[PDB]
mmCIF file with all atom_site columns, C-alpha atoms in Angstrom:
data_model
loop_
_atom_site.group_PDB
_atom_site.id
_atom_site.type_symbol
_atom_site.label_atom_id
_atom_site.label_alt_id
_atom_site.label_comp_id
_atom_site.label_asym_id
_atom_site.label_entity_id
_atom_site.label_seq_id
_atom_site.pdbx_PDB_ins_code
_atom_site.Cartn_x
_atom_site.Cartn_y
_atom_site.Cartn_z
_atom_site.occupancy
_atom_site.B_iso_or_equiv
_atom_site.pdbx_formal_charge
_atom_site.auth_seq_id
_atom_site.auth_comp_id
_atom_site.auth_asym_id
_atom_site.auth_atom_id
_atom_site.pdbx_PDB_model_num
ATOM 1  C CA . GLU A 1 1  ? -51.432 -48.253 25.097  1.00 0.00 ? 1  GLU A CA 1
ATOM 2  C CA . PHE A 1 2  ? -50.146 -45.246 27.114  1.00 0.00 ? 2  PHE A CA 1
ATOM 3  C CA . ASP A 1 3  ? -47.938 -45.164 30.002  1.00 0.00 ? 3  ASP A CA 1
ATOM 4  C CA . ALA A 1 4  ? -47.711 -41.817 31.920  1.00 0.00 ? 4  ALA A CA 1
ATOM 5  C CA . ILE A 1 5  ? -49.421 -38.322 31.755  1.00 0.00 ? 5  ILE A CA 1
ATOM 6  C CA . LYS A 1 6  ? -47.159 -35.342 31.451  1.00 0.00 ? 6  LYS A CA 1
ATOM 7  C CA . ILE A 1 7  ? -48.406 -31.809 32.209  1.00 0.00 ? 7  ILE A CA 1
ATOM 8  C CA . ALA A 1 8  ? -46.479 -28.803 31.101  1.00 0.00 ? 8  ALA A CA 1
ATOM 9  C CA . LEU A 1 9  ? -46.996 -25.234 30.114  1.00 0.00 ? 9  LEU A CA 1
ATOM 10 C CA . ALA A 1 10 ? -48.574 -24.903 26.578  1.00 0.00 ? 10 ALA A CA 1
ATOM 11 C CA . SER A 1 11 ? -46.319 -23.288 24.248  1.00 0.00 ? 11 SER A CA 1
ATOM 12 C CA . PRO A 1 12 ? -47.977 -21.056 21.703  1.00 0.00 ? 12 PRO A CA 1
ATOM 13 C CA . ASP A 1 13 ? -46.442 -23.220 18.755  1.00 0.00 ? 13 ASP A CA 1
ATOM 14 C CA . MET A 1 14 ? -48.042 -26.182 20.628  1.00 0.00 ? 14 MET A CA 1
ATOM 15 C CA . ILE A 1 15 ? -51.372 -24.309 20.876  1.00 0.00 ? 15 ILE A CA 1
ATOM 16 C CA . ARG A 1 16 ? -51.171 -23.673 17.126  1.00 0.00 ? 16 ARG A CA 1
ATOM 17 C CA . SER A 1 17 ? -50.278 -27.356 16.660  1.00 0.00 ? 17 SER A CA 1
ATOM 18 C CA . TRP A 1 18 ? -53.341 -28.495 18.396  1.00 0.00 ? 18 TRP A CA 1
ATOM 19 C CA . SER A 1 19 ? -55.826 -26.227 16.658  1.00 0.00 ? 19 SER A CA 1
ATOM 20 C CA . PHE A 1 20 ? -57.368 -27.155 13.378  1.00 0.00 ? 20 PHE A CA 1
ATOM 21 C CA . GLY A 1 21 ? -57.934 -23.605 12.248  1.00 0.00 ? 21 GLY A CA 1
ATOM 22 C CA . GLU A 1 22 ? -58.766 -20.159 13.785  1.00 0.00 ? 22 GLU A CA 1
ATOM 23 C CA . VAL A 1 23 ? -61.840 -18.645 14.943  1.00 0.00 ? 23 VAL A CA 1
ATOM 24 C CA . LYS A 1 24 ? -62.344 -15.124 13.568  1.00 0.00 ? 24 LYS A CA 1
ATOM 25 C CA . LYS A 1 25 ? -65.877 -14.469 14.132  1.00 0.00 ? 25 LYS A CA 1
ATOM 26 C CA . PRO A 1 26 ? -68.054 -14.837 17.215  1.00 0.00 ? 26 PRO A CA 1
ATOM 27 C CA . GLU A 1 27 ? -71.432 -15.909 15.642  1.00 0.00 ? 27 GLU A CA 1
ATOM 28 C CA . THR A 1 28 ? -72.480 -19.321 16.545  1.00 0.00 ? 28 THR A CA 1
ATOM 29 C CA . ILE A 1 29 ? -75.709 -20.666 14.692  1.00 0.00 ? 29 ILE A CA 1
ATOM 30 C CA . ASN A 1 30 ? -77.930 -19.252 12.011  1.00 0.00 ? 30 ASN A CA 1
ATOM 31 C CA . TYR A 1 31 ? -80.746 -19.864 14.601  1.00 0.00 ? 31 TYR A CA 1
ATOM 32 C CA . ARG A 1 32 ? -83.206 -20.734 11.790  1.00 0.00 ? 32 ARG A CA 1
ATOM 33 C CA . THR A 1 33 ? -81.162 -22.914 9.714   1.00 0.00 ? 33 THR A CA 1
ATOM 34 C CA . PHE A 1 34 ? -78.930 -25.305 11.504  1.00 0.00 ? 34 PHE A CA 1
ATOM 35 C CA . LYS A 1 35 ? -75.842 -24.572 9.704   1.00 0.00 ? 35 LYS A CA 1
ATOM 36 C CA . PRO A 1 36 ? -72.890 -22.986 11.869  1.00 0.00 ? 36 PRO A CA 1
ATOM 37 C CA . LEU B 2 1  ? -71.898 -0.001  21.925  1.00 0.00 ? 1  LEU B CA 1
ATOM 38 C CA . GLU B 2 2  ? -70.919 -3.323  23.860  1.00 0.00 ? 2  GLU B CA 1
ATOM 39 C CA . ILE B 2 3  ? -73.776 -2.450  26.407  1.00 0.00 ? 3  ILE B CA 1
ATOM 40 C CA . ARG B 2 4  ? -76.514 -1.233  24.196  1.00 0.00 ? 4  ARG B CA 1
ATOM 41 C CA . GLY B 2 5  ? -74.968 -3.787  21.491  1.00 0.00 ? 5  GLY B CA 1
ATOM 42 C CA . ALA B 2 6  ? -75.316 -3.065  17.621  1.00 0.00 ? 6  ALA B CA 1
ATOM 43 C CA . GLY B 2 7  ? -78.658 -3.519  15.994  1.00 0.00 ? 7  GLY B CA 1
ATOM 44 C CA . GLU B 2 8  ? -79.333 -5.617  12.770  1.00 0.00 ? 8  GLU B CA 1
ATOM 45 C CA . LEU B 2 9  ? -76.650 -5.303  10.318  1.00 0.00 ? 9  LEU B CA 1
ATOM 46 C CA . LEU B 2 10 ? -79.343 -5.991  7.570   1.00 0.00 ? 10 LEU B CA 1
ATOM 47 C CA . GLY B 2 11 ? -82.547 -3.876  9.160   1.00 0.00 ? 11 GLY B CA 1
ATOM 48 C CA . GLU B 2 12 ? -83.470 -0.843  10.982  1.00 0.00 ? 12 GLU B CA 1
ATOM 49 C CA . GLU B 2 13 ? -82.948 -0.535  14.930  1.00 0.00 ? 13 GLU B CA 1
ATOM 50 C CA . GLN B 2 14 ? -79.548 0.626   14.993  1.00 0.00 ? 14 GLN B CA 1
ATOM 51 C CA . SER B 2 15 ? -78.852 -0.238  18.718  1.00 0.00 ? 15 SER B CA 1
ATOM 52 C CA . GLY B 2 16 ? -79.913 -3.343  20.699  1.00 0.00 ? 16 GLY B CA 1
ATOM 53 C CA . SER B 2 17 ? -78.928 -7.065  20.734  1.00 0.00 ? 17 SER B CA 1
ATOM 54 C CA . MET B 2 18 ? -82.148 -8.528  18.966  1.00 0.00 ? 18 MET B CA 1
ATOM 55 C CA . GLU B 2 19 ? -80.788 -11.454 17.275  1.00 0.00 ? 19 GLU B CA 1
ATOM 56 C CA . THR B 2 20 ? -79.277 -9.908  13.953  1.00 0.00 ? 20 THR B CA 1
ATOM 57 C CA . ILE B 2 21 ? -78.124 -11.863 11.122  1.00 0.00 ? 21 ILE B CA 1
ATOM 58 C CA . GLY B 2 22 ? -74.120 -12.595 11.342  1.00 0.00 ? 22 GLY B CA 1
ATOM 59 C CA . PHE B 2 23 ? -71.410 -10.236 9.481   1.00 0.00 ? 23 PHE B CA 1
ATOM 60 C CA . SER B 2 24 ? -70.053 -13.606 8.101   1.00 0.00 ? 24 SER B CA 1
ATOM 61 C CA . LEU B 2 25 ? -73.503 -14.616 6.953   1.00 0.00 ? 25 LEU B CA 1
ATOM 62 C CA . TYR B 2 26 ? -74.216 -11.240 5.688   1.00 0.00 ? 26 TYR B CA 1
ATOM 63 C CA . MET B 2 27 ? -70.981 -10.932 3.369   1.00 0.00 ? 27 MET B CA 1
ATOM 64 C CA . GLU B 2 28 ? -72.006 -14.406 1.615   1.00 0.00 ? 28 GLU B CA 1
ATOM 65 C CA . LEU B 2 29 ? -75.543 -13.238 1.450   1.00 0.00 ? 29 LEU B CA 1
ATOM 66 C CA . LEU B 2 30 ? -74.389 -9.826  -0.250  1.00 0.00 ? 30 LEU B CA 1
ATOM 67 C CA . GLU B 2 31 ? -71.810 -11.636 -2.564  1.00 0.00 ? 31 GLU B CA 1
ATOM 68 C CA . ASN B 2 32 ? -74.605 -14.069 -3.769  1.00 0.00 ? 32 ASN B CA 1
ATOM 69 C CA . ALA B 2 33 ? -76.712 -10.911 -4.357  1.00 0.00 ? 33 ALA B CA 1
ATOM 70 C CA . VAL B 2 34 ? -74.025 -9.184  -6.095  1.00 0.00 ? 34 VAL B CA 1
ATOM 71 C CA . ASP B 2 35 ? -73.381 -12.241 -8.710  1.00 0.00 ? 35 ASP B CA 1
ATOM 72 C CA . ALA B 2 36 ? -77.012 -12.695 -9.295  1.00 0.00 ? 36 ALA B CA 1
ATOM 73 C CA . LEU B 2 37 ? -77.649 -8.923  -9.916  1.00 0.00 ? 37 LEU B CA 1
ATOM 74 C CA . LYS B 2 38 ? -74.673 -8.427  -12.116 1.00 0.00 ? 38 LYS B CA 1
ATOM 75 C CA . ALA B 2 39 ? -75.256 -11.523 -14.173 1.00 0.00 ? 39 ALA B CA 1
ATOM 76 C CA . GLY B 2 40 ? -78.769 -11.115 -14.488 1.00 0.00 ? 40 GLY B CA 1
ATOM 77 C CA . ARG B 2 41 ? -78.664 -7.405  -15.010 1.00 0.00 ? 41 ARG B CA 1
ATOM 78 C CA . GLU B 2 42 ? -82.180 -6.904  -13.422 1.00 0.00 ? 42 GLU B CA 1
ATOM 79 C CA . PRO B 2 43 ? -82.754 -3.022  -12.210 1.00 0.00 ? 43 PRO B CA 1
ATOM 80 C CA . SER B 2 44 ? -82.899 -2.125  -8.454  1.00 0.00 ? 44 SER B CA 1
ATOM 81 C CA . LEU B 2 45 ? -85.937 -2.717  -6.528  1.00 0.00 ? 45 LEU B CA 1
ATOM 82 C CA . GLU B 2 46 ? -85.830 1.139   -6.347  1.00 0.00 ? 46 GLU B CA 1
ATOM 83 C CA . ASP B 2 47 ? -86.087 1.332   -10.058 1.00 0.00 ? 47 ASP B CA 1
ATOM 84 C CA . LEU B 2 48 ? -89.278 -0.937  -9.796  1.00 0.00 ? 48 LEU B CA 1
ATOM 85 C CA . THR B 2 49 ? -90.498 1.700   -7.165  1.00 0.00 ? 49 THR B CA 1
ATOM 86 C CA . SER B 2 50 ? -89.787 4.472   -9.337  1.00 0.00 ? 50 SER B CA 1
#
């Protein structure tokens, strides 16, 4: 499938490319209902 | 703040960690309350206290 492994410094455009959203709040879980 | 930590956003006890409800939850809860209230047009609980 794949051949080599390349490592480099992660550009901010590339970081925004990885992400599937943006975390704005620090709350984790409702602690009584398990919906995040 | 940041040491003492803000207390409940929807309770008493201004200063302390003590497992509040989240602001992100709170705005949704308040929006649900606003929409039910206005649609329903029930008086406030305080009116039912008055």
